[PDB]
């Protein structure tokens, strides 16, 4: 599970 | 470039 | 699990 | 360039 702001 | 969240 | 910001 | 969450 995760979040990516990229 | 990219991203993965697996 | 985990959160990125890059 | 890139960002995984596995």
Same mark, same amino acid.
């Given at each position: &599970? &995760? $979040? $990516?702001i990229?």
């Amino acid at each position: &599970g &995760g $979040v $990516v702001i990229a």
